[PDB]
Amino acid sequence: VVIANAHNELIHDAVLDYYGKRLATCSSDKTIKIFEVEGETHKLIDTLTGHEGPVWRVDWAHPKFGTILASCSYDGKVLIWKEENGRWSQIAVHAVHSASVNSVQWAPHEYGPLLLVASSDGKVSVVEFKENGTTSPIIIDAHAIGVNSASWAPATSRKFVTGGADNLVKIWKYNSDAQTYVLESTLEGHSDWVRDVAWSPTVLLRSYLASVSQDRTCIIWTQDNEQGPWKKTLLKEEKFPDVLWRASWSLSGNVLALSGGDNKVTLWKENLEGKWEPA
Template sequence: MYGAYGQVPPQQQYGYHQQQQQQQQPQYAAPAGNHQHQQHQHQQGQQYQYPPHQEQHAQAAAVVEPEGGQQWEQGDVGGIRQPAPTIYVDTQHDDMVHDAQLDYYGTKLATGSSDRTIKVYDVSGDAYTPNATLTGHTGPIYQLSWSHPKYGPLLASASFDRSVLIHREVRPREWTLIKAFVGLHDSSVNSVQFCPHEHGLMACAASSDGRVSVLTHDGADDSWTVEYLSDTPLGVNSACWAPYSVDRIDDGGDDDDGTTAIAMIPSAPRIATGGCDNCVRVWRKDAMTGTWEEEAFVSSDPGMGHKDWVRDVAWAPNVIPGTSVVASCSEDRTVIVWKQGVAGGGEGDVGDAGGKWTPTLLNTFDDPVWRVSWSITGNILAVSSGDSNVTLWKEGLDGSWSTVSRVEDIATTTGGKGGAD
């Protein structure tokens, strides 16, 4: 299933935590005129700015794919493939919806909003019913992430209030807060994501203070530890985990039958980040030292990367062994697909780490691009842009990308006022 298609809010000011001490309720002011983030980066006192093309009191709604909707087209009518139906969920939020995430099985939908609440819904077919309203944040909630069901129904949330909260459904429609990382960062937390379950119960969070935090749960004593990666002083907008994979290692020995012995070693955890310095970075946890190290990447090379803030990064599921694929989107209106390994690098590249990353421009849009998300099969990329539309893209055999579907703005489909996140 796809992740969220909602727009990510503009980067927050670094002075928020200082100003918050001087006032009990932060002010979230809507912008006047066009979105000029380079200017408001230096303005003082502006606490929060809504994304462009959105109204402060627009009707809050979320677009979800129906259960079993991994097939983006279904049915034949007169020999023509018909698009799968789109479900519009009236979330009943009092303010903008910034993120909407389906759980592993696609049976629960969680939405985060500027009204500082999380709404959870049970989804079955084309129907949905309210499950719970989760509170605890004191600022807009920017991103949500479900854990793998191996660890139960855990939901992490990232907020402008500098914190990450983790809720758990202890029994049907009864939720409890199991961990509150209050003051985790010095500024807005813009992104959070649980890692592949094979690495354990871990999550990463990206912040405007320029750091990425890695939250690790210790099952022995039910404690959590926090590590920080210093990414870019200008602020980090997004962070995502690489899918779990196994490295095939030839140990050089021979078995009794004369065949070469092969060792299968799990790959190290890796994180991709997108920041306000226009760069994409990849971090890898060294198996020997246990420390996080930055890998070589070409996004900062002239003519190779984005020309404006990177709003989102998404690591594709493993499709071709030994190949890593990352999509990034930016304020410069472009989406770039980065490949490393057999399918993306040059001669001698063997995939996972150490190989050369090569970029491919997917498309240049008419508006800034806010979010990118891969299908579970890794062959379809959903792109959410500033025109309030979601487009689905697929790569051809020649390496070029083309649109395969489009999800229109709710205002277009219903004739109503407001947009769908």
């Protein structure tokens, strides 16, 4: 089911929607492309223009909010697109960061239309898109040199994981008194810029985190209980041939998709020992 030649420039991201049917792609041509997918056939629905720089990442909102899509770019902005009345249009613009916006992710539907946004200015912002038009973005200094990736924990208590160019991995928790996301834990282990962090949706009694870096190592991080120690586990003892860019968790199974600069995809599962083997 290959959708060959989607863009004429290098593609940076491709994500399916909540149903696993509708595809959203973004590239250096500064545009988003939306594809309907069925059998071995694809159909280009629209092209979404507005970004003034390469589009880095995209994410689909839960359908219960409507057919929404957030995108982020080098231009320093997050653009929100909807498919209402059979056509696609830009409805919102989040322009709070003073540098490239590297990562964009929708919260668990439980919380609402919250958007997690990581940037090269070292700020990480949180944006609820209110039904009254206005927004009140919560903003935090998260990382030195810049933030590269931010992911939500699953719905329980509100948590997300950030990856930065300061080599660190950080877990933030919302607080009522501080009215913001305070730091819960700094996770150390990476010798170079972190590119992607990913929290597993696993509903089990253990929490799984997957960091990925320019140092060409993947580290799984595990937590057996609320509060207490995060355990560093190196996916494999030898380094990967090239810089790792992405990690992705299966919706159930706790399987791990790993993307490298060698253009190779590697799937990993957890054995009895607590170590990781191919899947």
